[PDB]
Design a protein around this ligand. Structure first.
Ligand code: NI
Ligand code: NI
Length: 253
């Protein structure tokens, strides 16, 4: 089992990182993909991947911080990407919940990263918050299908899901929301989407799945996400772990 999207580089783990890692390790979580989307979070991610063998890095620039993105950050990320542990360019996309960065700048920075991924020949990890259509529109126009990737913690509909799996040959990743009771969409997506297109994550410290809602997430909780998807699709737990793992390795290597 792999946690394909985890912020171990977050400040909330300063004090107990090694223990958090260990608990995930003992629970069956073999590999984890740390996401650096900032100057600071990127540096932390690079350190962590050199620190732990089973830790891989995905680096890029978060849409919320699109205004801070400069040509120097672009070049910097480009050379950093040479690291054999950096397997994807990420947490790029659009986010309309915060206003730090206007939609205009976000789109620009988004396009630039897609071009970066193309040159680096690496898949992209997409962050989308309340900007679904604008986001798919850009992945189509820039021919993102050329690099492939993940619609991380997918917060849209199955109709949009098919667009991501059919036109774009992208995978869909689910986290805690799939265990939420009153939010039916994440579950409907879990059931609709082919097991050959799904991946699991926690995006910890955020969005803990039941029965830990309201508490800081931890990659070990990804087991709960797998469990729920197994029940939702009438599959075995072991089958889900193996399928999502097969998928992650095929997308990243
Ligand atoms: Ni996110
Ligand atoms: Ni994230």
């Amino acid at each position: 089992l792999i946690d394909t999207h985890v912020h171990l580089n977050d400040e909330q783990y300063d004090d107990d990182l090694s223990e958090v890692i260990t608990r995930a390790r003992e629970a069956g979580v073999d590999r984890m993909f740390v996401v650096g989307f900032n100057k600071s979070t990127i540096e932390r991610a690079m350190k962590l991947i050199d620190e732990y063998d089973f830790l891989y890095g995905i680096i890029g620039w978060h849409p919320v911080d699109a205004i801070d993105f400069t040509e120097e950050h672009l070049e910097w990320i480009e050379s950093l990407a040479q690291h054999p542990k950096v397997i994807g360019i990420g947490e790029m996309g659009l986010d309309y919940h915060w206003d730090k960065s206007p939609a205009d700048v976000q789109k620009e920075v988004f396009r630039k990263q897609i071009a970066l991924a193309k040159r680096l020949k690496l898949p992209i990890i997409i962050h989308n918050r309340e900007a679904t259509q604008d986001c798919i529109d850009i992945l189509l126009e820039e021919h993102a299908e050329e690099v492939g990737g993940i619609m991380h913690s997918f917060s849209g509909s199955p109709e949009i899901a098919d667009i991501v799996t059919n036109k774009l040959n992208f995978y869909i990743s689910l986290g805690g929301p799939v265990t939420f009771k009153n939010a039916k969409q994440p579950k409907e997506v879990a059931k609709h989407v082919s097991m050959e297109r799904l991946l699991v994550e926690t995006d910890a410290p955020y969005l803990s799945p039941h029965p830990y809602r309201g508490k800081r997430n931890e990659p070990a909780r990804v087991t709960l996400v797998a469990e729920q998807i197994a029940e939702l699709k009438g599959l075995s737990y072991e089958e889900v772990c193996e399928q999502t793992t097969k998928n992650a390795e095929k997308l990243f290597n």
